[PDB]
Design a binder for this molecule. Structure first.
Ligand SMILES: O=C(NC1(C(=O)O)CCCC1)c1ccc(-c2ccc(NC(=O)c3nc(-c4ccccc4)oc3C(F)(F)F)cc2)cc1
Ligand SMILES: O=C(NC1(C(=O)O)CCCC1)c1ccc(-c2ccc(NC(=O)c3nc(-c4ccccc4)oc3C(F)(F)F)cc2)cc1
Ligand SMILES: O=C(NC1(C(=O)O)CCCC1)c1ccc(-c2ccc(NC(=O)c3nc(-c4ccccc4)oc3C(F)(F)F)cc2)cc1
Lengths: 593, 593, 585
RNA sequence: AAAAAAAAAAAAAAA
């Protein structure tokens, strides 16, 4: 809709029945005209933000990865307030902004064509905010729309939404007051494939009042309830994708990309062909050894022989043969998993690594614990203090103080490297936040436990999913310090592989999709997998959930089976945890009163 | 004067008649003897500072610009107290120090020979300061003197002074108490060229008491008054330059450079000669293409044709040919401007680009506005708060708090680029300070309007002079918020092109030198010019002024005409501003009372 | 001792007689199993910390120095409280952690083989701390143990300890309460050579109550007392080294280096031989000529005429020949020093450079002074304020406030260079701390002088030991501001050169070891010497001491003579300082 | 410092 010469606008509607209706509006052609693409997004006439996307003129070939950057700029004037810092100006980004950056980055990054080496930057500025609303999902939609209008090698619009379960109804785009009445709230992002929605990213948590609401008669958020909630977000995503596509069509764009971006593949087909024809049988036979040192030595020897021969042949292309060898290895391993239920370390597909749990490991700490799962090793420490030491928050959003704080540390020696030790990175912030949300619904209230609580996790050893081990260590350490939890919490990380396998016969056209689910995946198994997801909770309901994938679709029964398998693993881990400690201890003599 | 063996000193006197007399003293040969040059400067034997200049041993020519660096170090013991921060130590430079750094950098950088690639660093430390004095103008002279003593390829001494207008007298080096009785305050820097002073830098503003002083019977600072102020500053500059030269002569120095610094010109003579002979007539006729896209297409076609022709001849020297082509293009465009008032975009000499102004653009802000001039687009937003939210300042200078704050942001997408989004750079600080000084003299007093005020400028699009559009946006947004200003303020950026060309006679050796003034210059037009300046004010008097040049001299009539042209331009802009809003609105329901 | 499967343990005992006994435990095999080496250390089962060492997979030859990094992580939960900053999280390292990093880095860095270019990182995390103890000396031992278990080209275990003098007894690992009753506090680190302890690093200071305790009957810490304190620390170091070696033996390790690390020497043997055989006699003759600028120009032309005739013989190896030429110059100069008592600037071995002192150089400052020694030039400024302006400290250690603050600045132009001006580096922090500790013992009490004091030193010109010059400048400025010091303090920096020399007999190969001590060394002389040390104090006792060395041993009489020479220089400097000012203004 | 031109397991020194 060309409201003005050169200005176009589009609208999407969110219908919640008796809970109200909301409108989302996209506008282009009036602000930031020198960017590659720019869009203004409105929610209900009082929420307003701007998104802009630009690309660099020339690529950076010497990089080995795609350089995408996302930035979120919160302005205090959006809340009608002057900043409280000493210099009265906005400084380094807050935790909320970093989490929003991660939420945008997770689904957009795999949507670009592989091999791209130009720099892409996306900047989102918050301009006006109603005191009872949240801006993050609107930001996801605006970033997608501006990138779509930028005319880049970018795959289709992406839609995002939040849904909260209230009295048996999944409400879309709820307010803070409404979220205060729900048992579960979930952020979901996806795209449209062949007229259907394919889910790409999920980030979900139980609310802080879930136990009291369930005692009052509400439904508890179990696995099937969460699956139904995933089903209820698809129409909203479809409406948002349609509005974005209409905006792109109205304002020209669509076809004629004009600017062409070169791509830099890791290896050429000619190099890959030689490596396959030379080392297929050797690699296939070598995997059956399964002896760690013997397996590694055989792999290294075959790699050295192949690289020597192909360096004699291709005359100075060593990285390409190295990449092709790894690709062939991964291709063989995936087929072996799908055919024989073979895992790289010899476990069955439902087996957990060796487990151990201990408490009281640090002499003068208020509480501490050590948790081990295979080569993953987490140390947790708890400290209690007076309630005035709660963190005071001066951000744009509605939060004003934080009674319970969780900090996560990942040093370089955890995997045996060297590196800088300094301020935490974005991934550390994300993992810490996910582990923090898993414990919040089970903490006691302030009136019955008047203390500030700080929890610290140290990843002393890493071989896959330290964030799920932080949950278990947090539970054990909090119980060791005398905090009266409502129920213990545990977590697990899971993977999924899938591909087309020909059934016993002929005609080579009866190949059908086949899926396999793996429990407690290794660090290397994540690269071979097709979907990753982490689940945490008590023995009665789920408290945190995270997911990201690339598949075009997933049958409902496959997802239900995977969720059930994760629940079984969680129960097994809770049984081991209970043997170390099963009730709160006495408070430490060193802690205050 | 050799007061001590190896120690020399020189004096300059500044006579203000009935307002007093002051002396500036330069000393060398005592402190910091391992630097290339070092000088100590005194003002009235209680203000004392040190300046030192050093150069790197080897050139580093993998850069394309001259690497000069200026640093100012404020020591809190110069005011006699311990720093108030948590660690009791001076940290990041304050705003005043950054502004002093830029005042030093602006005149000194073009005074070095072109092609230099050695790193040059200047450090100025403030050692002792009287409570009623300002140190910046003293620092300019010290920075010039220490560089002059270092035996570098540096063109002559530079003198700097501040003049303030009090009761019809222009007083040099005034105190803080004297500035409270003045209507105008100007900082001027220049050099000596054949017995006469050539002005190079100006930074000037109207004082905070100008309106009531003019109501009391003082003369308002109009354009002719400002020009008389520039005339009054020359004798002080001449005296300071003479003192510096005398000190340089007394301590040896003078000649005998000893160390020789290599230079790295952009292009050689042969390449320029070839490029000129190949394309002088092709470029001369190709400027007539009014169409922007057609113009640039023809330009790039000609450049590529020249590059392909000359690639084989010079074995591949593409940088030199690219530089020579641009040099020839600029040389021809300047001739077209001087001969027949040609402009690159087709405007006439006194034409402004298309203007637009609008208010009430951000839904929940206290006040907001959008201002557009050509491709320059500025968004301004106002916030009001309680008086306790004024900024508290802890610095060397006499200022202790700020009731009105202005912050200016320049994101990479405004030009279409990618880059870091972090703390603001020095140029952002400078532009914001200029725009703040433009609006200070018309604000209401605290007794009349008891609020703290924060103003933010976002440069959403930029093609030349965003700082002057910040002034218009600030006035519009402040009126939208309900602030009762005494008068609206507008600003404009101006250019000047000069050269001597053949007169309408014979011989081909008789040439007259002419000047052309351009209104509202583009970003590209700044590189074609010999002077650029900016003027802001009301319909009655000037409030801010900035000027940079490197011309040997400018006749009085030329400068008067340029200032009159700028006045007409800002009056035209004020008329357009008044249609959008001409009186204060009602204060927002969201603002406090 | 394998307490658990894969876990090994070892113990060391520190016996202080009637002052008590303490135990240190080392444990390995249970925490951080993916590092190259990791060790947990305990002191009396309430103090616990962890140390881990890792190495990079590939070298990096584009550097020209050995890249070693040391990090100390103080966790506030070790003290049982939440951090007080706005974000409630630990940020940049505090001054204490940086000084602990320096204490670890000083003795460990020269213990690696020459030419190593792999990156090496050591990280020490503080987990539990008793309120009356100090963790730094424990950290030294833990870092040594984890590096020794890592299987790297590392030269033997290193042991560190603190000893304090209380009522005539040197007590090892004293508590905070015990330090309040002592006159001197000293940190010492060393290693074992053929059954004996060789000292490598020393960092010592007098306490804040020394004057009052000496007035009450205690013995003042003179030079011989400090020398005896060095002897008293050796058995403790031996016991700690033994425990570390036992732990290394128990958990495998010991031999079998397995992974091999390439080395990158500055020059090859052939290049050095070619450079020496072409220029030895000529260079020695140039050294024998008594002239500074003449020898400078002669050497500069010799370098040009030697690089030019070997450029064809060695293909693009100019850096190798330059390094070999510099090494040969160093060897000849050291030989000349040991034989004829030669110094490059012509001074005698007990001579100080030209001195000058002046006060009241900054017009509005509360106190100010300018101090010059040779090309070293220091400016010092003092400011006084209300006692509420004292620094408030929130950290693991027992300190909570700081009445006297000293800040040291080292701008690039003091050498003639260009560089970044900004946050102070670790070396600036260390030098400032040494200068602050030298002056703390003579300050008046808060009761008789109720002010906060900030002292700033700025190295306007540097050619060797600005740290000791800042002590003199601070004394002068404090007196100029009116602070009633109990006594003035001065300092000096000293060097020592040692090597084997031919006897006056025969056989051509019968040699003896000789030592020579130099007063007030230049920056260039620090590279020639085998040991360097700095001493500061009053006319009656020592207040600060710092020492670094690599020698396998030092006879007692040689060290006593060196300390006496330093004391004589200190007295001369105090006499020059008394002329400028001899009482508070 | 002058100028429109982040993803992932992958400090030492006068210089
Ligand atoms: O912890 C982790 N991440 C976090 C978590 O909490 O989870 C903690 C911090 C944030 C999240 C983590 C994640 C990934 C890894 C990992 C390590 C190694 C390999 N790499 C191979 O694993 C391999 N590489 C080869 C090969 C290479 C070149 C040529 C030929 C072969 O072969 C093989 C073969 F499969 F055999 F083992 C993959 C992943 C470890 C830990
Ligand atoms: O917005 C601004 N804002 C600022 C303000 O406060 O003002 C904010 C902070 C300071 C600035 C700004 C915006 C753009 C510019 C700019 C200037 C020059 C060129 N350069 C060409 O533009 C060009 N390059 C060629 C050429 C190149 C290669 C070969 C041959 C020819 O030709 C040409 C031809 F002149 F014709 F147009 C571009 C942009 C400056 C300022
Ligand atoms: O100020 C200082 N302050 C510090 C302090 O102490 O607190 C502050 C914190 C720590 C230090 C300081 C100042 C200067 C130095 C320094 C040392 C060595 C050299 N280097 C030569 O000096 C040389 N280089 C050659 C040569 C070069 C090329 C080829 C052949 C020979 O020859 C020679 C020859 F020995 F003759 F003099 C220069 C400067 C050290 C410290």
């Amino acid at each position: 809709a060309e409201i003005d010469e050169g200005v176009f606008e589009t609208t999407a509607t969110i219908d919640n029945g008796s809970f109200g209706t909301r409108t989302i509006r996209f506008e282009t052609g009036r602000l930031a005209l020198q960017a590659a693409g720019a869009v203004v997004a409105y929610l209900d006439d009082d929420n307003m933000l701007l998104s802009a996307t630009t690309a660099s003129k020339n690529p950076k070939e010497h990089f080995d990865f795609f350089p995408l950057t996302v930035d979120v700029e919160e302005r205090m004037y959006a809340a009608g307030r002057i900043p409280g810092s000493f210099f009265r100006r906005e400084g380094r980004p807050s935790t909320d902004a970093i989490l929003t950056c991660r939420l945008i980055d997770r689904p957009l990054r795999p949507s670009f064509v592989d091999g791209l080496r130009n720099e892409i930057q996306i900047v989102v500025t918050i301009l006006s905010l109603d005191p009872g609303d949240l801006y993050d999902v609107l930001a996801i939609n605006a970033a997608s729309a501006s990138t779509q209008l930028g005319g880049l090698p970018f795959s289709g619009p992406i839609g995002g939404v939040r849904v909260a379960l209230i009295d048996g109804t999944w409400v879309g785009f709820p307010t803070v007051d409404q979220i205060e009445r729900a048992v579960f709230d979930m952020v979901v992002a996806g795209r449209i494939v062949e007229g259907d929605v394919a889910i790409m990213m999920v980030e979900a948590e139980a609310t802080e009042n879930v136990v009291e609401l369930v005692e009052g008669g509400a439904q508890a958020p179990t696995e099937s309830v969460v699956a139904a909630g995933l089903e209820a977000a698809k129409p909203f995503i479809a409406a948002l994708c349609t509005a974005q596509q209409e905006l792109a069509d109205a304002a020209g764009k669509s076809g004629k990309p004009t600017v062409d971006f070169p791509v830099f593949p890791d290896y050429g087909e000619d190099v890959y062909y030689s490596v396959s024809s030379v080392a297929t049988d050797e690699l296939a036979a070598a995997l059956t050894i399964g002896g760690k040192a013997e397996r590694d030595q055989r792999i290294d020897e075959i790699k050295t022989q192949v690289v020597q021969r192909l360096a004699d042949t291709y005359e100075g292309r060593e990285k390409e043969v190295g990449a092709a060898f790894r690709a062939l290895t991964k291709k063989l391993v995936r087929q072996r998993i799908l055919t024989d239920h073979f895992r790289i370390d010899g476990r069955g597909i439902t087996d957990i690594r060796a487990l151990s749990a201990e408490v009281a490991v640090v002499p003068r700490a208020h509480g501490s614990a050590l948790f081990e799962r295979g080569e993953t090793q987490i140390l947790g420490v708890t400290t209690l203090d007076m309630i005035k030491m709660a963190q005071q928050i001066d951000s744009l959003g509605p939060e004003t103080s934080k009674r319970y704080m969780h900090h996560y540390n990942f040093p370089p020696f955890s995997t045996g490297e060297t590196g800088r030790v300094g301020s935490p990175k974005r991934r550390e912030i994300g993992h810490g936040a996910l582990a923090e949300r898993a414990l919040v619904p089970v903490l006691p209230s302030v009136e019955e436990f008047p203390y500030a609580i700080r929890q610290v996790s140290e990843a002393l050893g890493s071989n896959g999913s330290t964030s799920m081990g932080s949950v278990c260590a947090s539970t054990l350490a909090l119980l060791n310090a005398g905090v009266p939890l409502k129920a213990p919490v545990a977590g697990i990380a899971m993977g999924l592989v899938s591909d087309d396998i020909q059934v016993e016969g002929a005609v080579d056209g009866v190949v059908e999709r086949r899926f396999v689910t793996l429990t407690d995946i290794l660090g290397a198994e994540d690269a071979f997998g097709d979907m990753d997801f982490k689940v945490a909770g008590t023995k009665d309901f789920v408290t945190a959930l995270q997911l990201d994938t690339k598949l075009d679709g997933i049958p409902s029964q496959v997802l239900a089976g995977a969720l059930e398998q994760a629940k079984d693993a969680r129960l097994t881990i809770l049984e081991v945890m209970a043997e170390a400690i099963d009730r709160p201890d006495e408070m430490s003599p060193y802690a205050p009163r």
